[PDB]
Amino acid sequence: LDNWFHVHEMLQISTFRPRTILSFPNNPKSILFIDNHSGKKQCRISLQIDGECLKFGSSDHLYKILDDIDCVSAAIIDFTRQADHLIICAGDKRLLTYKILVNKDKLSFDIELLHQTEIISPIHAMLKFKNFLLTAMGSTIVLYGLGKKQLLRRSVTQTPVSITKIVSMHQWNYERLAVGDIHESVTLFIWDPAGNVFIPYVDDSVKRHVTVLKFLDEATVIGADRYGNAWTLRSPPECEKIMSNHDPSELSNGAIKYPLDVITLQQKLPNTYDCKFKFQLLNHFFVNDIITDFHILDSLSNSDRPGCIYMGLQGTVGCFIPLLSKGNVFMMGNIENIMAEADDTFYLDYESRKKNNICEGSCSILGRDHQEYRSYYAPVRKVIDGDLCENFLRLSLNEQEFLAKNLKSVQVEDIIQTINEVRTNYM
């Protein structure tokens, strides 16, 4: 319960501080690493597949050095199914294209510089769109194709006025996008072929600073905050009906019939409702770390319930498991409610026995309530925190049986059963 992992890795300090990590779409797991130099701008690229790394060409070195290239952001792309290119964005504001080679029983990685392209923005975020590079300028989203001697702008989409910069963004099956901001929050776009443009169809409710963002689904989005909020949003069914029943080409121009309220919100509140829909908050949570990477895994160690696991910056990995049925979240919710004020229950018992004849923060060891701490920035909505219910396992049998008496429901033993059920069955 404490570890749940093993870490496979004089004084040793490397001058190169790592930057990002990449993986090829076609190869199921082949992981390419990109670092930086602290000093004169310099980079290295180290590819590993299967057990340990790779050699570079016939050279002894297992890594590649790139002089004068620094990487603000980088992503790998395959323009054709048989060719693999790498993408660097220099702080010089220059877009650098590369080519990856696997030698295969001579096996080695061979990187090859292709083109040079000047960029207006720093390019904080980019990803793979179909056949294309989908990149975000500071203001605007450019979709680059593959040209020769350099890469070309296939399409450009001007952002709504609200978006200053794009920290991160993600796609859903090439049809949809969710675009994040520094200041403002996620805004979802749809690619319209023959319109050659992404159309925003939904805004977000509040201001949230989004570091990393993913899709669980078509209609829902995961996002984290610079300040440590882990949230998930969902497009309203009023919007899902419209986009399910209509083609994207009619959104920007053409006839789409919106209920009376939406338009009245357009003339009444043009600033908020400019995107004509709003994300109803679906899940909200606070993890005191800053989440670096979300990943949605269809199964965790063959488990049925697909989870989403995140690694935080200060370091952590945690998961959000969707609970099937209800009485799962009913029992879990009741256990969390128990452990929440459990310190207060101990204090009131210890108080009554003093009336007939241990401080208040005894069981929590600290004054913070659970709902208060986990609420913090914004109240947790549907998320029940299992990290609390896990503390019920360590308490002595006297304390546990003292707590579970508040329930007409099952005994402490079945409680512990349901608690320990999550790590076993759900992953």
């Binding site: 805004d203 977000d204 409702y273």
Partner: protein
């Protein structure tokens, strides 16, 4: 005096604004108009309800005279206490019945209207007609 006459024109203020149509004539006397335009015109902010500058204490409404006293949510109206106790100008009930109405029958139940992110209720407004409206856009089709 001089500060009151020092004020820039509201149209001079519009240019600083990405969404100029929200700014209004009274924003000229905003002590910090360039700032207040940025805040008021910021993305998700919801402008102050306009019943200020009226002295009517926010409800003089003639429409308030004609508002219905109340209507039970139909799920609760199923409980039949409406007939058991006459509120308009004893009824033994079952615990299982009432409990199931709130939980078994009414767990998924939610009020039909509610309101949205920036919905603000002005005096003359009445939600009920808009509820029958939204429900009607639903039922009736060409």
């Amino acid at each position: 005096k001089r500060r009151k006459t020092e004020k820039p024109s509201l149209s001079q203020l519009k240019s600083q604004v990405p969404y100029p149509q929200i700014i209004e004539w009274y924003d000229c006397d905003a002590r910090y108009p360039g700032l207040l335009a940025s805040i008021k015109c910021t993305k998700n902010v919801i402008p102050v309800p306009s019943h200020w500058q009226s002295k009517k204490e926010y409800l003089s409404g003639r429409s308030l005279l004609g508002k219905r006293p109340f209507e039970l949510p139909d799920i609760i109206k199923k409980t039949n206490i409406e007939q058991m106790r006459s509120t308009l100008p004893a009824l033994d009930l079952d615990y299982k019945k009432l409990h199931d109405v709130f939980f078994k029958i009414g767990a998924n139940w939610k009020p039909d209207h509610l309101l949205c992110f920036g919905d603000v209720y002005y005096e003359n407004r009445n939600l009920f007609e808009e509820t029958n409206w939204k429900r009607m856009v639903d039922h009736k089709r060409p």
